[PDB]
Amino acid sequence: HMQFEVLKRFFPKESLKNCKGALWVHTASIGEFNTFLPILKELKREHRILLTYFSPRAREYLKTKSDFYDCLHPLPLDNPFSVKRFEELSKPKALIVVEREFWPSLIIFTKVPKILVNAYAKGSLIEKILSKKFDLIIMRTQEDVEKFKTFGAKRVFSCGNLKFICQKGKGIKLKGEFIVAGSIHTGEVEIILKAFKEIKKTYSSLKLILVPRHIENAKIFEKKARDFGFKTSFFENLEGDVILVDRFGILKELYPVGKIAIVGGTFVNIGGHNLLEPTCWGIPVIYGPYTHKVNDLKEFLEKEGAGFEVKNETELVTKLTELLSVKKEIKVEEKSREIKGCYLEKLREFLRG
Amino acid sequence: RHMQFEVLKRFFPKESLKNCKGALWVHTASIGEFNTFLPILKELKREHRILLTYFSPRAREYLKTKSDFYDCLHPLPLDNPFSVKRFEELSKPKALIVVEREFWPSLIIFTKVPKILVNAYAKGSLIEKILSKKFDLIIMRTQEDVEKFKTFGAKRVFSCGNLKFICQKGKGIKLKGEFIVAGSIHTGEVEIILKAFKEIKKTYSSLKLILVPRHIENAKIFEKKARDFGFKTSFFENLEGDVILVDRFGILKELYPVGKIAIVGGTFVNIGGHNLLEPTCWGIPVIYGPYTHKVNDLKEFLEKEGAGFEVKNETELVTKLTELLSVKKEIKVEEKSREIKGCYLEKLREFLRG
Ligand SMILES: [Cl-]
Ligand SMILES: [Cl-]
Ligand SMILES: [Cl-]
Ligand SMILES: [Cl-]
Ligand code: NI
Ligand code: NI
């Protein structure tokens, strides 16, 4: 089945010797790794990297990212001896913990200089006790900083949320004016078509590019839009009022083509997909009420004036019209350069000496 | 997050564990293991106080809703000698049942509690050689796994089958009519199912299809698709339709008994399969498509049992449906289930007696 690597954790591999002096980066699982990746890309340039993870579900994925590290090993089991053997074999120059892997033996029984990034405070007793054990803490909010400072942590700063860093890609150019609806589920399709139908009464040249959450549904989606009375086409072919995308990936590259984006997983009870993507391009994003899985991101976008929650077909029409008549300025990308810059600055300085 | 990792509790187990002394200690890493062991736990819970531990923070909230099946709840202690021994000293458990695997070295090496591994399989790895012999009793899925573990010098290793194959039926519903039941169906599965059912109705004109979407948000859509096929439609409780859509969450497992044949989705689209087992517990055959890669043990069990049929296209689906409609297939999954359960429960009770 899956590889738990229990022996490796308990008795870290001898070959760690071959990675001595590296910068040790710990990403509990795939999420943490992706969140830290933009920082890792830069650090990887000035340091050899020793990468560890906790979840067995992350091994296979991380193996595909060998470009971003020199050595890969699971985190040692949390006893003084496994942890000390890990540190003694690898003699790491420092350890960066992404988000909050409060492993007591790891934190208590290693001597490696320790750095926590993207942390937030909960006010719990384990925080009171272990926070002071880090040489440097970078938090998401100045509020979190305050709490940790009352915990006797020195060297604590706020740099913002690493999750809000833009990772854009090349992108695509298309002539025409478009709305781009991405990661749309079957149960979201009709409300969007009915909204776009109401809109086209006014904006006759406007086209909808529609990208299903599952590209397999590209044909069911087409037939629906056809049933609604739209001329339709499949991407590459831009002839339709509703343009369906059937090729995987591509979605993040399509956003720059539009004036307004709509992101699914939000009009049905899914919890929201990736709201950030379109806004990194200076485009406002509209979403439905079901954002519980991306709540921090939601509150961030609303504060940045870049995200807009709509409750129903009517609100959607109303919001779309507002954004088509008045171009909403978006500054998410500058914030992104700012968070990234702050994190990378403090880390480079800390690592310098 | 907003999730509780309970690090402090794992590191320094709660003093109140005292008030649970002499209990049977059952460890279920997360929700899946708990549900897998639940039928056995229900019986053991009658004869033992239960101290229940879990590893995944994601299980805590769920497990709190299961307070009827345990006496004490606490996360597994962190894997260092001191936390583990403190857990053990506080709770003085009579024994520890580990569900499936959870080879936590310090836990296994530094506790004196008699330890029992349940529903295990053998990967043949070095950590297995080393830790397997530290269990007082090991109950495995196959006689093949037993042989491997036997060669690691494990004594007291048996096979009682896969706990995951234990039926958990529920009350069940009754309706007048003849039905086929398609459950956990995704949008991309609706057309091969409707195409096949249209062909079948030519011959069995009285047959009705109860259609339960994977996600109810897709029901309106499903109903409209049925209409395009020219079926009379209706929403559950109304049995008017040739195709009857189901609009309520849950419900599915209680519906199966109503049918002559079940179809279970996540299988005609590359999803990997939903719960093939449930219909067969009613002595009803189940049909699925080729994409069962997330339920492959279950798929293999059903095939050997003569209760599960893989179909690759609309024709084989029509073919298999017609076969099962013309000659009723005998299904003995429930029989197998009582067997697996009784075996596990027999061995456990005997170990715990003395
Ligand atoms: Cl201590
Ligand atoms: Cl001590
Ligand atoms: Cl302790
Ligand atoms: Cl102790
Ligand atoms: Ni998916
Ligand atoms: Ni779901």
From Swiss-Prot, chain A:
Species assigned in the record: Aquifex aeolicus (strain VF5)
One Pfam assignment: Glycos_transf_N
Binding site for CMP: 212-213, 248-250, 274-277
Sites marked Transition state stabilizer: 99, 163
Active-site residues (renumbered): 32
UniProt cross-references to SUPFAM superfamilies, sorted A to Z: UDP-Glycosyltransferase/glycogen phosphorylase
Complexes and interactors: Can form homodimer, homotrimer and homotetramer.
Membership in a protein family: Belongs to the glycosyltransferase group 1 family. Glycosyltransferase 30 subfamily.
PANTHER family for the chain: 3-DEOXY-D-MANNO-OCTULOSONIC ACID TRANSFERASE, MITOCHONDRIAL-RELATED (PTHR42755:SF1), 3-DEOXY-MANNO-OCTULOSONATE CYTIDYLYLTRANSFERASE (PTHR42755)
Signal peptide start and end residues: none
Listed name of the protein: 3-deoxy-D-manno-octulosonic acid transferase
Metabolic or biological pathway: Bacterial outer membrane biogenesis; LPS core biosynthesis
Effect of residue 32 to A: Large decrease in catalytic activity
